[PDB]
Design an enzyme around this catalytic site. Structure first.
Site, mmCIF file in Angstrom:
data_model
loop_
_atom_site.group_PDB
_atom_site.id
_atom_site.type_symbol
_atom_site.label_atom_id
_atom_site.label_comp_id
_atom_site.label_asym_id
_atom_site.label_seq_id
_atom_site.Cartn_x
_atom_site.Cartn_y
_atom_site.Cartn_z
ATOM 1 N N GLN H 2 0.827 -1.195 0.000
ATOM 2 C CA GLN H 2 0.000 0.000 0.000
ATOM 3 C C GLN H 2 0.868 1.255 0.000
ATOM 4 O O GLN H 2 2.067 1.218 0.287
ATOM 5 C CB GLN H 2 -0.926 0.004 1.215
ATOM 6 C CG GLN H 2 -1.789 -1.239 1.326
ATOM 7 C CD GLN H 2 -2.566 -1.296 2.625
ATOM 8 O OE1 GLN H 2 -2.751 -0.281 3.296
ATOM 9 N NE2 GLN H 2 -3.023 -2.489 2.985
ATOM 10 N N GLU H 3 0.237 2.383 -0.327
ATOM 11 C CA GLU H 3 0.927 3.669 -0.401
ATOM 12 C C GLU H 3 2.115 3.595 -1.356
ATOM 13 O O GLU H 3 3.200 4.103 -1.069
ATOM 14 C CB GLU H 3 1.376 4.131 0.987
ATOM 15 C CG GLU H 3 0.257 4.199 2.016
ATOM 16 C CD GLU H 3 -0.799 5.230 1.669
ATOM 17 O OE1 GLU H 3 -0.563 6.040 0.748
ATOM 18 O OE2 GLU H 3 -1.866 5.231 2.317
ATOM 19 N N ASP H 4 1.909 2.950 -2.502
ATOM 20 C CA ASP H 4 2.917 2.775 -3.543
ATOM 21 C C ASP H 4 4.032 1.823 -3.126
ATOM 22 O O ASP H 4 5.017 1.677 -3.859
ATOM 23 C CB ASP H 4 3.531 4.116 -3.962
ATOM 24 C CG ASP H 4 4.290 4.025 -5.272
ATOM 25 O OD1 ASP H 4 3.641 4.010 -6.338
ATOM 26 O OD2 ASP H 4 5.536 3.966 -5.236
ATOM 27 N N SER H 5 3.908 1.166 -1.976
ATOM 28 C CA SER H 5 4.911 0.203 -1.553
ATOM 29 C C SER H 5 4.889 -1.009 -2.484
ATOM 30 O O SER H 5 4.077 -1.107 -3.408
ATOM 31 C CB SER H 5 4.673 -0.210 -0.102
ATOM 32 O OG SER H 5 5.569 -1.235 0.288
#
Ligand SMILES: [Zn+2]
Ligand SMILES: [Zn+2]
Ligand SMILES: [Zn+2]
Lengths: 53, 65, 43, 53, 48, 168, 114, 49
Positions: H2-5
Site C-alpha cells: 500500500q501507499e505505492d509500496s
C-alpha cells in the site's frame, strides 16, 4: 551441507511447478475480465481439451 | 558480469546455455526468440533473463589485471 | 608483502625503504591479500 | 583469489550451482550429528582451482 | 612521545576490506588509500 | 592539593586533608590524629581512582572506594569511603561538619549499605552458525561476542562451544 | 543489520514446545492449538481435513504475522468429542491419503517406460 | 504494498535479485606539521601513546 529451499533458494530442487485446475469456468472461482466477449478475449487453456466444455 | 546461475523468477538453471545461446546467435545466425525456444526456455522469465543479460565480465577482463 | 600494479611482482620491502617498484618507475605498490583464512557464504 | 570479481560474488554464484542429491536422505544435517569442522558424514567438500596462462 | 591518529572505520558501516594502496603525494609524503567492499542485499526498508 | 585529597606523608603514613590551604594543610592520619603540616611534608598525592585497594567489612562484604558504609558501634556515622588503608579506612560524611566530615574508622567496625578468546579467529560448533569464521570482539562473562566474516552482525555465543584457530 | 534468523523459521527455539494446546472460553468445547515454526502448508491441510469431518464444527487457522513462523488453529467440535482425538484422526487420514498417492504415483511411473 | 509500496520475493532476493556492492574509500596522509616532524604508519603498541 544438507538443507531445504526454505533456508535459501539455492537448494530449490524444482524451478517452476505449474499448478492448474478448473480450465472451463465451471465453479465460477474466477470472473474473466472482458470488454467485448469473455471467450474471445481469453484463449482456451491447454488442459481444456481434457474436460467437457 | 556473468549470466545468472538461476532464474530470479523460477530458479531454472540458465547459465549452461549462455554459451550455447551465443553460439546459436552467431554460428547459426538465428533470431533471439528462435534460439531461446531451441535452447528449451518456455517461460518468458528465463527468456528475458538471458536476452537482457550483458556480459560485463568480458569488458572487465580487457584490462591487464 | 607488496606487489606492483603493472609488473605484479613481489617486493617484500621493509620500513624506511622506497615505495617505488624496482622493475619500473610506477609506484602504485599494491599489497597482496592477507594470508589469514577467509570464509564466505552464498547467503 | 585475484579475479576481477569479488569473493562474495563468486561464493554466491557457486552456491546456486546445482549438486547431485540422490542420496540426500542418507546424508545428515551438520547441525544434527555431533561433529567438528564439517565432517564428511554431514557435508560434501570440493576444491576449485583455475588460472589462465 | 606520539599520539595515535588512526582512521577508525565508520561506526554505522561495516564490510570486508577490498584493496589497499600506498603511494607518494606531490611533496613525497606517504599516502594510503584503502577501499572497503560490502555486499548489500535488498531488505524491506530498501527503496526501489 | 585540594580538600579530601589523600597525602602520603611517609612510606607507611597516609593522611586525608580536612582543610586545604596554600602552603599549610591540616590532615587527619590513619590513627585519627589531626595535625598541621607544610606543602613539603607531602611526598606525593595518592590517586584514589587508580588505587586498587579493597578491604573486608564485619559482614564479609567487599568494600571499595566510594561505597557508603555505616558504623556498627558509636554514633553509627554514615559516609562514603575515600581511601582504604591497611588497617583503617577514611570516610567522608555530609552530615558531619567536624574535621570537614572526614573520620578514620576500622574496617571491622563498619557495614556496607585476561580473555584468550578475544582477538582470535573462532568457529562455532553447536549453533545455527556452526563452522562459520568469526572474530571475537568482547566477552561479558560466560558469553563471547563474535562478528561473522560473511554477515554484518555480532552474535553472542558461549565460548566453550567454539574452536580456536591460528592467525593463518 | 538485524534481519531474522532464516534457519530459525523452521527450527524450534531453545525451550520451546512444538505445539501448545490451551482451552478457549469463546464457545464450549473449543480449543486453541499454537503451532510453532510452521507455515500455511501444514495448517491449511490440517484445517481442510478437519472440516471434511461431520463431527467437526469449527476449524480456523490464523497467522499472526509473516515475520514469526507460527500460527494458531481454533478447533470446536460437538459435546463429548475431544478435539485432540479429532486432530489425531485427521492427521492419520492425511498420512493414509499421502501414502496412497505416493503408491499410485510410483505404480504409474513404473508402468510408463519414460 | 500500500501507499505505492511493493512486495519483493525473498527467494529471488537471496537468489541474486537486486544485490549490490558498495565500495567506500578512506584516504590518509602524513602531512607534516613542522619541518623534521612527520607521521609514521605503524601499529600502535600502547607504549608512550
Ligand atoms: Zn525462469
Ligand atoms: Zn613495476
Ligand atoms: Zn557432521
Amino acid at each position: 551441507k544438507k538443507g531445504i529451499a526454505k533456508e535459501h533458494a539455492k537448494w530449490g530442487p524444482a524451478a517452476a511447478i505449474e499448478f492448474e485446475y478448473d480450465p472451463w469456468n465451471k465453479l465460477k472461482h474466477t470472473d474473466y475480465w472482458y470488454e467485448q466477449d469473455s471467450a474471445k478475449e481469453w484463449p482456451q487453456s491447454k488442459n481444456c481439451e481434457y474436460e467437457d466444455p | 558480469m556473468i549470466v545468472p546461475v538461476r532464474c530470479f523468477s523460477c530458479g531454472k538453471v540458465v547459465g549452461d546455455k549462455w554459451e550455447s545461446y551465443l553460439n546459436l546467435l552467431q554460428e547459426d545466425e538465428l533470431d533471439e526468440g528462435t534460439a531461446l525456444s531451441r535452447l528449451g526456455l518456455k517461460r518468458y522469465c528465463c527468456r528475458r533473463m538471458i536476452l537482457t543479460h550483458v556480459d560485463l565480465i568480458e569488458k572487465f577482463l580487457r584490462y591487464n589485471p | 608483502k607488496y606487489i606492483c600494479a603493472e609488473c605484479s611482482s613481489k617486493l617484500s620491502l621493509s620500513r624506511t625503504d622506497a615505495v617505488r617498484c624496482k622493475d619500473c618507475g610506477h609506484r602504485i605498490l599494491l599489497k597482496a591479500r592477507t594470508k589469514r583464512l577467509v570464509q564466505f557464504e552464498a547467503r | 583469489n585475484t579475479t576481477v570479481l569479488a569473493d562474495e560474488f563468486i561464493a554466491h554464484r557457486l552456491g546456486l550451482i546445482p549438486l547431485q542429491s540422490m542420496d540426500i536422505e542418507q546424508l545428515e544435517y551438520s547441525r544434527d550429528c555431533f561433529c567438528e569442522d564439517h565432517c564428511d558424514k554431514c557435508s560434501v567438500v570440493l576444491t576449485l582451482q583455475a588460472f589462465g596462462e | 612521545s606520539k599520539r595515535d591518529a588512526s582512521t577508525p572505520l565508520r561506526s554505522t558501516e561495516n564490510g570486508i576490506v577490498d584493496q589497499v594502496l600506498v603511494t607518494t603525494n606531490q611533496d613525497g609524503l606517504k599516502f594510503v588509500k584503502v577501499r572497503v567492499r560490502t555486499t548489500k542485499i535488498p531488505q524491506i526498508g530498501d527503496k526501489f | 592539593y585540594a580538600l579530601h585529597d589523600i597525602v602520603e606523608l611517609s612510606a607507611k603514613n597516609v593522611a586525608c586533608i580536612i582543610q586545604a590551604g596554600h602552603d599549610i594543610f591540616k590532615v587527619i592520619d590513619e590513627t585519627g590524629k589531626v595535625s598541621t603540616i607544610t606543602k613539603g611534608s607531602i611526598l606525593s598525592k595518592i590517586n584514589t581512582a587508580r588505587a586498587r585497594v579493597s578491604s573486608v567489612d564485619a559482614n564479609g562484604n567487599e568494600i571499595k572506594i566510594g561505597d557508603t558504609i555505616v558504623e556498627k558501634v558509636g554514633s553509627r556515622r554514615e559516609g562514603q569511603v575515600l581511601y582504604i588503608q591497611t588497617q583503617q579506612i577514611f570516610v567522608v560524611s555530609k552530615k558531619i561538619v567536624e574535621n570537614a566530615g572526614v573520620f578514620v574508622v576500622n574496617p571491622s567496625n563498619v557495614e556496607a549499605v585476561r580473555e584468550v578468546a578475544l582477538g582470535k579467529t573462532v568457529r562455532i560448533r553447536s549453533a545455527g552458525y556452526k563452522g562459520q569464521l568469526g572474530i571475537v570482539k568482547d566477552v561479558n562473562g560466560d558469553k563471547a561476542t563474535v562478528e561473522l566474516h560473511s554477515k554484518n552482525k555480532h552474535i553472542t555465543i558461549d565460548k566453550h562451544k567454539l574452536t580456536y584457530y591460528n592467525r593463518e | 543489520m538485524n534481519a531474522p534468523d532464516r534457519f530459525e523459521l523452521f527450527l524450534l527455539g531453545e525451550g520451546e514446545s512444538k505445539l501448545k494446546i490451551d482451552p478457549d472460553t469463546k464457545a464450549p468445547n473449543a480449543v486453541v492449538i499454537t503451532f510453532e515454526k510452521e507455515d500455511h502448508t501444514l495448517g491449511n491441510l490440517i484445517r481442510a481435513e478437519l472440516l471434511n469431518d461431520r463431527k467437526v464444527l469449527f476449524a480456523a487457522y490464523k497467522v499472526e504475522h509473516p515475520f514469526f513462523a507460527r500460527f494458531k488453529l481454533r478447533i470446536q467440535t460437538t459435546e463429548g468429542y475431544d478435539p485432540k482425538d479429532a486432530l489425531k484422526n485427521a492427521c492419520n487420514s492425511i498420512i493414509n491419503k499421502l501414502g496412497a498417492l505416493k503408491t499410485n504415483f510410483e505404480t504409474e511411473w513404473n508402468l510408463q517406460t519414460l | 504494498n500500500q501507499e505505492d509500496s511493493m512486495i519483493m520475493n525473498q527467494s529471488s532476493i537471496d537468489r541474486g535479485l537486486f544485490r549490490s556492492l558498495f565500495f567506500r574509500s578512506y584516504m590518509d596522509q602524513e602531512k607534516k606539521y613542522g619541518m623534521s616532524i612527520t607521521e609514521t604508519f605503524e601499529k600502535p603498541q600502547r607504549t608512550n601513546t
